[PDB]
Ligand binder design. Structure first.
Ligand SMILES: NS(=O)(=O)c1ccc(C(=O)O)cc1
Length: 167
């Protein structure tokens, strides 16, 4: 048993809810929250900027030190950093950004990072400003992630479409 509430079960291991991932993280304080990161860990908009804003910019300060030491992530890659006031850990995962021309086949590699963690709160990857089709992202998630993932979908209209079209 875990603390996640109000989710619709899609599969053995994937759950979904219409929720603001920031508000969900603040309530649950999960072991792992996933950030929809870019390779520079520049948390400017969407989930990364909202997560970073909710940490009072501490996520960005930590991230800048990580990049100064290690250089950029790979598209499809990840790093584990602090969860600050939102979670124990934040798993920063880089899905391909369609609006920058990245290979959508890298979306499966991105979701494979989730399998290193038993339970995660996470948004769909490559959605919103990354330019991928969220229906596709949910299908790759279900077909790739084997650990228990709790998906927060901000947009109520999209949530309803994801559920009603789910195979
Ligand atoms: N890639 S993003 O611009 O941060 C993004 C991620 C998820 C949602 C959503 O749940 O609706 C919206 C935008």
């Amino acid at each position: 048993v875990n603390s996640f509430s109000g989710y619709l079960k899609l599969t053995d291991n994937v759950y979904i809810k219409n929720a603001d991932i920031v508000e969900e993280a603040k309530k649950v304080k999960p072991t792992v929250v996933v950030n929809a990161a870019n390779v520079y860990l520049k948390h400017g908009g969407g989930v990364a900027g909202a997560l970073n804003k909710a940490t009072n910019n501490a996520m960005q300060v930590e991230s800048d030190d990580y990049i100064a030491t290690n250089g950029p992530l790979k598209v499809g890659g990840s790093c584990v950093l602090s969860g600050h006031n939102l979670a124990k850990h934040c798993l920063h995962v880089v899905g391909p950004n369609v609006n920058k021309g990245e290979d959508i086949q890298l979306l499966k590699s991105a979701y494979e990072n989730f399998n290193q963690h038993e339970v995660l709160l996470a948004p769909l990857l490559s959605a919103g400003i990354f330019g991928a089709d969220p229906i596709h992202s949910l299908r790759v998630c279900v077909d790739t992630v084997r650990t228990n993932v709790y998906l927060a979908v901000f947009d109520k209209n999209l949530y309803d479409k994801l559920v009603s079209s789910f195979l």
